[PDB]
Structure 1
Amino acid sequence: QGAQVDCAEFKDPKVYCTRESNPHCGSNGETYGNKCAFCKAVMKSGGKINLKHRGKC
């Protein structure tokens, strides 16, 4: 595979949260707005809640 899009990995930070970071379908049933917001949610959930589609699902 050679790695995937991991969340915590860009928490240096130097990446602005909650405005501009591209839309994406998260594996549950929702088109998440920013990557930070998706990441913040990923932390809670359960276990492995990766993205798949860009934009709408």
Structure 2
Amino acid sequence: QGAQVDCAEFKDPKVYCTRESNPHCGSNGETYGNKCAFCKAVMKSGGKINLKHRGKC
């Protein structure tokens, strides 16, 4: 096992942004999905934004 939803190791170089490759939906906070959007937000989320990323939140 091991949930592979890490987003630090796939930052660079010029990888995850703009053209969203997955409408993924946050805990109970937001609908987004471009790898950058999610890692970027979640980073500065607060520490209470888990994920229920499938389709809608």
- The structure with more strand, counted as a fraction of residues: 1
* Percentage of identical aligned residues: 100
> Which piece of structure 1 moves more, 13-22 or 37-46?
13-22
TM-score, scaled to structure 2: 0.67
The offset of 1:14, in angstroms, is 4.2
SS in 1 for 2:52: strand
Structure-2 change in CA distance of 1:52 and 1:10 (3 Å): same
| Structure 1 counterpart SS, 2:39 | helix
Gaps of 5+ in 2: none
Q: Is the 8 A contact 2:16 2:34 kept in 1?
A: no
Provide runs of 4+ in structure 1 moved above 6 Å: none
The alpha-carbon distance between structure 1 residues 14 and 52, as it changes in their structure 2 partners (threshold 3 A), is: same
Match of 2:18 in 1: 18
Give the drift of 1:45. Answer: 1.8
User: How many residues are treated as equivalent by the alignment?
Assistant: 57
Distance between the aligned counterparts of 1:55 and 1:7, measured in 2?
19
Q: Over the residues paired in the alignment, what is the CA RMSD in angstroms?
A: 2.1
The offset of 1:36, in angstroms, is: 0.9
The DSSP-based 3-state class of the residue aligned with 1:54 is coil
Partner Cα distance (2:53, 2:42) in 1: 16
